[PDB]
């Protein structure tokens, strides 16, 4: 249906270099099924359009409700990268239909890290570390509620700093103690609440 198309599409950012539309479709169709999010036989994702130059994709789903459920995959790791899943900017919630996902996907860590009391900044990361490896560094201290590694939009290369929020706010000081000042060749990690050094 044409009226619901805006409510059946999602933006996916930070996609792996060189990924094909078929590989992305298969990934999401499988994850939807394995996660218990798919609501009928057959594929929930109908199509994927990739903008290779600009590093983003749009997924199109067969139903409004499956599209909403797929928002729960925000931050899922695909080929080392934390996929950013968002509504299209022109999306308008429909009457009587839900706007937010209802099913949690175990192990998936959101990419939305709002400014808050215990949001952490991690600066000085080696630029060869992908999203997955930086997530593992941080998860050593405890489970994350949210995380984003900052990249150069034109090249896709890590800018060497990230933000995060732990599930347990009390882990924040443990990560600071374990990581702040750590020396890595020419780099020295700065790990502190992001409010301390925000511009």
Residue ranges in contact with Na ion by CB under 5 A: 14, 54-55, 151, 153, 156
Nearer to Na ion, 46 or 77 (CB): 77
User: C-beta of 117: minimal distance to Na ion in Å?
Assistant: 26
- CA dist 122 and 156 (Å) reads 19
**Nearer of residues 152 and 168 to Na ion, judged by Cβ:** 152
What are the CA-CA distances from residue 137 to residues 132, 134, 147, 153, 162 (Å)? 9, 5, 12, 23, 11
Task: Please say which residue, 143 or 156, places its beta carbon nearer to Na ion.
Answer: 156
Task: Return the beta strands (E) in the chain as ranges.
Answer: 9-13, 45-51, 56-61, 77-78, 81-82, 84-86, 120-123, 144-151, 158-166, 183-184, 187-188, 190-193
CB of 51 to Na ion, least distance (A): 9
Cα dist from 98 to 2, 10, 40, 71, 88, whole Å:
19, 15, 18, 12, 16
- Minimum Å gap between C-beta 79 and Na ion is 11
Minimum Å distance from CB 195 to Na ion?
A: 23
Tokens of 187: 């780099």
Min dist. Cβ of residue 81 to Na ion (A) = 6
Q: Which CB atom, from 36 or from 156, has the smaller least distance to Na ion?
A: 156
* Nearest residue to Na ion, scored by beta-carbon proximity: 55
Residue 155 vs 183, nearer CB to Na ion: 155
């Amino acid at each position: 249906s044409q009226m619901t198309r805006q409510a059946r599409r999602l933006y996916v950012g930070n996609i792996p270099f060189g990924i094909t539309e078929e590989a992305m479709m298969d990934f999401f169709n499988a994850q939807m099924r394995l996660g218990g999010l798919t609501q009928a036989p057959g594929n929930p994702v109908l199509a994927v359009q990739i903008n290779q130059d600009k590093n983003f994709a749009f997924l199109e789903f067969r139903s409004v409700d499956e599209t909403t459920q797929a928002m729960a995959f925000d931050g899922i790791i695909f080929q080392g990268q934390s996929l950013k899943i968002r509504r299209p900017h022109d999306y308008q919630p429909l009457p009587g239909m839900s706007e937010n996902p209802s099913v949690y996907v175990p192990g998936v860590v959101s990419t939305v890290v709002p400014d808050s009391a215990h949001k952490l900044f991690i600066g000085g990361l080696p630029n060869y570390l992908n999203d997955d490896q930086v997530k593992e560094l941080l998860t050593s201290f405890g489970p994350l509620k949210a995380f984003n590694l900052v990249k150069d939009s034109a090249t896709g290369l890590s800018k060497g700093y990230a933000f995060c929020e732990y599930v347990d706010i009390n882990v924040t000081d443990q990560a600071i103690a374990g990581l702040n000042g750590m020396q890595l060749g020419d780099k020295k990690l700065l790990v502190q609440r992001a409010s301390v050094g925000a511009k």
